[PDB]
Swiss-Prot record, chains B, D:
Gene3D superfamilies: Aldolase class I
Name of the protein in its database record: Pyridoxal 5'-phosphate synthase subunit PDX1.3
Residues that, per the record, bind D-ribose 5-phosphate: 19, 148, 209, 230-231
GO annotation, biological process: amino acid metabolic process; chlorophyll metabolic process; hyperosmotic salinity response; pyridoxal phosphate biosynthetic process; response to lipid hydroperoxide; response to non-ionic osmotic stress; response to oxidative stress; response to salt stress
Induction: Not induced by cold, salt, drought or UV stress, or by abscisic acid or jasmonic acid.
Example GO molecular function: protein heterodimerization activity
Family matches, as PANTHER family: PYRIDOXAL 5'-PHOSPHATE SYNTHASE SUBUNIT SNZ1-RELATED (PTHR31829:SF0)
Highest classification ranks of the organism: Eukaryota, Viridiplantae, Streptophyta, Embryophyta, Tracheophyta
Length: 277, 275, 276, 275, 278
């Protein structure tokens, strides 16, 4: 199936960090740090949060600048439900579209029918039900999301534990109870059973939301994620190039505290961020 | 395979299924022209009136009914009572009806019906519920109103609902179907199967409060595939004449002249209860 | 340890049916039909429901009559918290005390300290948390309880699925998340980990509450219980003797539908029961 | 002086006090081994069942009971009815029990018990209440559950509460005792007396729902000094055998073998009521 | 014999001490000079985290190394609650204690760090006995009974110390049979509830923390039964940090000597002003 081919392609991103970039300078810094891909958007989430205004797909000119700037995969964000923003991005010839809750929602009731596209999609989730609905709409990769643009890992941790926790519950569930589990998740039964049989999400699952330090990036990996997104934590810090590299190494070496010490040491000022509580 | 069971239930299209509590009532139904009999302990109108815990009938009573007729024999099991369904299947009947008229045995889960060889009937009140039962392995749906009142109102409501949501679904923007499945709390693939087919993927019968021939013909004109009658026949003044009249109404549902002749002088319809 | 020895004694009842008896006649019927034990009490749960009034430990005279009337283990019931009733029962020389919610509660805040006794205790539960609390207090056998005295098996199914489902959740759970799990259960952490490592309850788990028919009894076994209690469903029914044997057979041959048809065939009236 | 009355009540430790309505019941209790009899109009289970205003017994009936026995004779007065207590004291009985089982005569104030020569019993449900009664001049406390139901549950609750608060108080930071007295709404000096003593400053008996020997022994094992039994004996099938059995249980409360022999074949316990 | 009990013994060595939050090598020196039993490295003192907002995390490993190099007394550092990777890093630096601290921004709302997986001992905060005992079952070797953070107001430290200690005294004379229910009500492990009953004290070292601003405050915590105190803001948000640090240390050591308490309090400079929240 072409869906299973898209799911197959994203497997290459395991062990990696995907970095949000707003220009070609940010893209090249991300590639040099060892990012597995770049994510082109208008403004980083912390800026979107602070400034407000309507956040949309980036000008295609800018996306073309980022694409010619690097040889790693280039991803770009479209507003939820804005299938025309997605058609434009596809036609530009990038590698993934992230239908992203950080941009301004364009359709509160429906997401993009992602099966109508040739190129693979990333979607956000906060729980298993949401993940499975995005996958059924045709998302080839999942981003388990915390708080966007605060530098606070708390919600990312909550959502990763929730998704992974329901998968472990599901794994051992009495088959006869799975119909009601599916109902309760409002997720498609066949995808729930597929999740049960595999003992993991049927697609690549990354963490996002508030990853600010190498320690945060490694934590996500130890909680069972395949990789991480970093939106704000790199380009809102005092030394983006160094910090980018440290986070990449943290994800590569997530179970090595000696290395985690080394890459974390003398990194300069992290993004101050915001404590919402 | 599930399609075999679904195919079997097609044979019942155009028929009336008559609840029976003993072999005398069983013979009355077959002679009256029923497409099948349904063995249960007490008719739903008596379960309502009397209370107590309503369970699967004693296997000996089901064996007697099975002897007494050549038409398909169905029996009822309590929702979620998978061992009751094992016993019914072991006896050799033709369908199990996992029925809400009996006393619920599991509030959160129905029977995993795909583990059985013989077909199941399940109840529903809406499309979402139908599709959940079907995914569990029901080969036939009963669209249910009120049990044991002789009042057709909730049957009319639920039949209009199931069918109305199917007509909505047929013409729906494909892109909106994912959310529609979320909202129905139903499996997406069954929603699309229903969409492409343009009708329920399994046989749909009306049930609950069918008391007169007019009621039965009404259900068929609303688009059902047949009707169940529980109380309407054996809580009436003359069961045998009334049963034949309902069978005739279901078979000739669009013939007013016929409906007049069969409804003419039928004796007392069941008492019933307005709520 | 003394506690493990009590747990071993109750383990010998696996595959069995424990029947409530109020006199010596019933106790003989239960033994003939093949019960693993009898449970002596004043009135069967359905009669306690219908009649009301305070329900206590049975007269020790009645218990002795039952004890000498049979050769299978003898159990008797004490009110929750009534540690003196339990003292008396142990002094009569019976085999188990069931600290039972069917009797009138004597202490709302505290159960009996069951560790202070020689003979093993049965306690009821509705969820995993509660089972584990009872086991920590010294219960050697757990009765997962539904509705008492109704012939309706619905709550017993609920509570059996609850307990078993929490145990299954617990098996794959991230170890780091077990501390909070134990807090939420209001359960001792060591017992939660013990449950995790075993993948089952640390003691015998029987179903009780509304088992009216052989189908009911076998359902409990297929959901994974070690055995069943039958309180009203035999002695509030048409033919107690025959229904009792049929239930023993259902438990012994729970996954054999041909046997279940056979023993279910022509049993006379089950208990009327009440729906709610 | 108050210590004389408190000292007198010590003599009752280890005993059972039996409510009686006539001289026949009075003789039954003394022969059965009661440490005292309590004269009242109707046993609490009949007051509950029947209603009406429950007052002090007629002095003639109390005189008859006083004649009929040599053990201490107590009688009940309505809460706050100080003239009832004057009459009882004038008759020459040994204790007055200002009892909540009778119909309350003053909702805001109890009897000033220090104005009487003879000792008073008062009820309580908690330590704070005990200490208030004691300050008013009660020489003995009855820790009370439910009157007239044969259900020990509230007795167990209140006995655990009184004793638990005493065990808490014993080990309490001295500096926190002032606030603890504020919270109990109890006199600070009595709270400290209770603290230093490590137990109630007056005799504490359990009462309310004591129906079987096991119940009586349970109260003693919880730390009481004796038990009252109102309904449990004279609403039972055999009062005389049951009374002796309760006396024996109270005297031999830590002997299971004994409790078996005395509870063995006692006939019907009182009906009672679950609430 | 056991790994945990050895960790508990390490923490015992700190009885009678004052642990001082330090944010750099200078403050760390000030603390050792003044007689601190240990230093606690963190990014900003609690009063600054309160006033400034922002996400607060583990200090840069570099800053911790600079603090560790500047002193010979034990070095503690703080990690966010649930952030087990921060703690791995802190352990790999080779410090002596980790404080899973509620002053830093929470990283995991439902779960604390599994502290038995570490070699070095942990401190955790609590506001009641139930909490303390849960932290201990997770592997905390030392408990900090916490009041308000960064206000210089001792009120909530007093409440929390009285609550924990009060509940410990409640257990002493408690009927053994009622303990199961008490354990349920505390949402604590039964075995630690009984161990607390048998000891008549907390099974691990208990310090006070939160709003300790003056020598009188410090001695008050000791007089209430604490084994020592933490001071964050009180020293380094005051007029004379170095003299105030020594005074507090002296007040903890001589907590039942009013004459000394007078001597050490006399002419101390501006105390931290702080804030009254009620």
């Amino acid at each position: 199936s072409p869906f299973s081919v898209k799911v197959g392609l994203a497997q290459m991103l395991r062990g990696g960090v995907i970095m949000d970039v707003v220009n070609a300078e940010q893209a090249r810094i991300a590639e040099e740090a060892g990012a597995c891909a770049v994510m082109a958007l208008e403004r980083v989430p912390a800026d979107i949060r602070a400034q407000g205004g309507v956040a949309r797909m980036s000008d295609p000119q800018m996306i073309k600048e980022i694409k010619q700037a690097v040889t790693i995969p280039v991803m770009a964000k479209a507003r939820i439900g804005h299938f025309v923003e997605a058609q434009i991005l596809e036609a530009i010839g990038i590698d993934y579209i992230d239908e992203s809750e950080v941009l301004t929602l364009a359709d509160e009731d429906h997401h993009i029918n992602k099966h109508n596209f040739r190129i693979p999609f990333v979607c956000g989730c906060r729980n298993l039900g949401e993940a499975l609905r995005r996958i059924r709409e045709g998302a080839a990769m999942i981003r388990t999301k915390g708080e966007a643009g605060t530098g606070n890992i708390i919600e990312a941790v909550r959502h990763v534990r929730s998704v992974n926790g329901d998968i472990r519950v599901l794994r051992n569930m009495d088959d006869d109870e799975v119909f009601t589990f599916a109902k309760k998740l409002a997720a498609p039964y066949d995808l729930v059973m597929q999740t049960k049989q595999l003992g993991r999400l049927p697609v690549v699952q990354f963490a996002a939301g508030g990853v600010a330090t190498p320690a945060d990036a490694a934590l996500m990996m130890q909680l069972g994620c395949d990789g991480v997104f970093v939106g704000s934590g790199i380009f809102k810090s005092g030394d983006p190039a160094r910090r980018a590299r440290a986070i990449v190494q943290a994800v590569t070496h997530y179970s090595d505290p000696e290395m985690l010490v080394e890459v974390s040491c003398g990194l300069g000022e992290a993004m101050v961020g915001i404590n919402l509580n």
